[model samples]
Target: KKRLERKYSKISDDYSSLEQVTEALARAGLESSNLIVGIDFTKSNEWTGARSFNRKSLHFIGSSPNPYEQAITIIGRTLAAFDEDNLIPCYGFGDASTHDQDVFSFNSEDRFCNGFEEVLSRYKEIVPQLKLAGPTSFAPIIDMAMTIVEQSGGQYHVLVIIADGQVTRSVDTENGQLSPQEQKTVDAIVQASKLPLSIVLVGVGDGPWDMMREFDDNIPARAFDNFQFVNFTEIMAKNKAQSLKETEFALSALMEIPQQYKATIELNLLGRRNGYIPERFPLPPPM
Candidate 1:
């Protein structure tokens, strides 16, 4: 009787895991997308001499959406389709108060925003508190996003960076080499590509955007082509209709993710099978 009762308990335990296995089987080898977001909070984005608190700058929180708000809404909404959990890990860079901290979360408590609305609300809440100051750097925020992906099992992460494209040290056109900090950012991105992570850079405003383009077009070595760059202002300039521009912008930004997903799966990097070292490129040590 004791043996029989033990068997019953074992059967009940198996039943508990059945539903989880069923859900895993439904996904097959596919991993759900998770979004990690970073936004620029540099001095360039703030209202200064003439536009001080005018409610007309990029950081302005008017009744309607500003450039930052528009990017978050349109891009976040589009990416949310691929994401199962609506939670997003949102961050801001280049604030004077948090300058020593490298990357800072918009929210005081948790880094995650419940949904699209909360992300926008957090941005609005932090804008005033931020004394926008910086030598705009990308490496720290990219590294922060990579650490999140490192801890996940079989999932994909996209780090969407909305910036003014004014990198700490502008592109070095003289020697055709990127500045030291810029190179470090590229190296961080290359490291991120070793895992199931893709980076989407959305350049806001009209600052030297070619620097961002360089990140998309040129990286010394990458496990996979994992960076996509888009300029929202440039897209708006090319199109007349607001709705059409939005569609174009979102599509352009997201176009590379499918191929990136395929590469990550086919490479079996997410599986960590026999350890994840590519033929030509070596994976970073497990964090």
Candidate 2:
């Protein structure tokens, strides 16, 4: 695990500023909150090799509770505080079907769960019964989150993703980068940013998060907004206080959401008038 961090050592972020911003937003009134839990069921997550043996893997990390469970709980625990009703809509992508197919999906069967508890319970039951196989992909689901928020009106939608590798259905494992289709996800967030949605990507296991950490680099600087990626395995190694850990990761993950909402609706920093709902950066930039 230390090895991978050294490889992607160039990546670093300080969310202290954003953490202050989040508290202000939640206090002044974030109003409605919706947490959409997303998981990556790519074949790599199912790996049973020696290197993949981390006691924490949902697949086969020996005995350690993998980042998926950890992330869902921690993130939900923090953000759930802002909501009156503690319900979370959970989704899983790259899962196989009855006949065994890489169905690009989110389990529509189990759409709503009871906050973080239900998310963990439902996940534990599902993993053993199903096979994880397929490359990671986020397009359809991000678009789906947008649709939900569109119908929701005033929602602060947070899509929490736990994946073993980069975001894409097709890619060489070595490159560890986003494909053209996967790149569309940034555009989705850019557009959805106008509404009230933010994305938090937690790379579980030992996949290189290069493409993830610097995901928005190649895009126009203006479009690089409202998203964050943190390697759970890496941060946990730091051994900081729990709250501090959550603050750095979740705060940055949620940072620009209200700001985007503010800029989109042209509201005051206090989130006055419209109460902070969605997009500031237009997609394609008038191309």
Candidate 3:
């Protein structure tokens, strides 16, 4: 988790001036409480070898119980830079299959909620938890987010999925070749895209980036219709100063999110609702 904390701390430090943070929040159309951050660790493993899940081998070095924990810390410190209200309700997700055997199946509502309390004591919010097992299926996580949106009556929704590699599941299938259940989960996510939700997929390890690329590509009719993919692997690599060869290919998948979300919001306003204007139409931009 230290890696996450360090990264966000760096960002927060860089924006030490309140004016810069305020300007950023304003530009992003975010209120202090509307933004939410989440991390997903659906594919953590402990074994070491040609196929081990150790984060160190994957280059996620820092003070974290695991990759998921680091992610929580990263986001927590970032939110800390803002006022308590602006912190939003951040959640962390992970399980034994993805991390240390001791801390698995921590979801947005349960374990994450507790982690939030430990990290952000004065925030006065509950971090929701979701206990999901793996070989991880992406659909369940999406479904969980949608449930939040549905229950909230479309008032709030934003999901950030952080994983080290492609999403997978072990369901019996008609076709061979390990078809992607993750894709199906993504499709479900697309169906719920209208509820003011944005998904940011951050690839964390050195695996083939193609799967992550597919997730990010937002061609509606073809695949996961609504959500767009953001590739953060490059930034991670550069930050670590690791050679491209040594870097995880999948990590590069999230490198494009900030700009992608910007474009989507602009296009949504211009294309949908006939450029509709509401009293708070431009109050906060989508995250």
Give the candidate number with the greatest TM-score: 1
lDDT of 1 by residue, 1-287 (tens): 33322221211111123235334334444556788888888776754212222435677667877778888888765667655688888888777754423777666554478887888887877787767787677877787777777656536888999887777674337776666667778778777766778788987766666678777766646666678888777776673887777767766666566556666766666644223432221121111
Tens digits of per-residue lDDT for model 2, 1-287: 33432332222342367557677676545666666666776666655222433433455433555667777777776667644577676666666541111222223443467667877776776667655655455654566666556656545576767777555534454664556656566566555544556566777777666566555233332222446676665665566897777776666556545544444333211222233333221111000
Q: Kindly indicate the candidate among 2 and 3 with the higher lDDT.
A: 2
Best-to-worst lDDT order: 1, 2, 3
Worst 10 residues of 2 by lDDT: 278-287
Worst ten in a row by lDDT for model 1: 7-16
The reply for model 1, stretches above 4 Å from the true place, is: 1-31, 46-56, 170-173, 271-287
lDDT of each: 0.67, 0.55, 0.40
Cα TM-score of candidate 2: 0.70
Best by lDDT: 1
Stretches of model 2 off by over 4 angstroms after superposition: 1-19, 26-29, 47-58, 61-64, 98-111, 169-180, 183-187, 216-218, 221-224, 241-244, 267-287
Q: After TM-score superposition, what is the CA distance of residue 136 in candidate 1 from its true location, in Å? A: 1.1
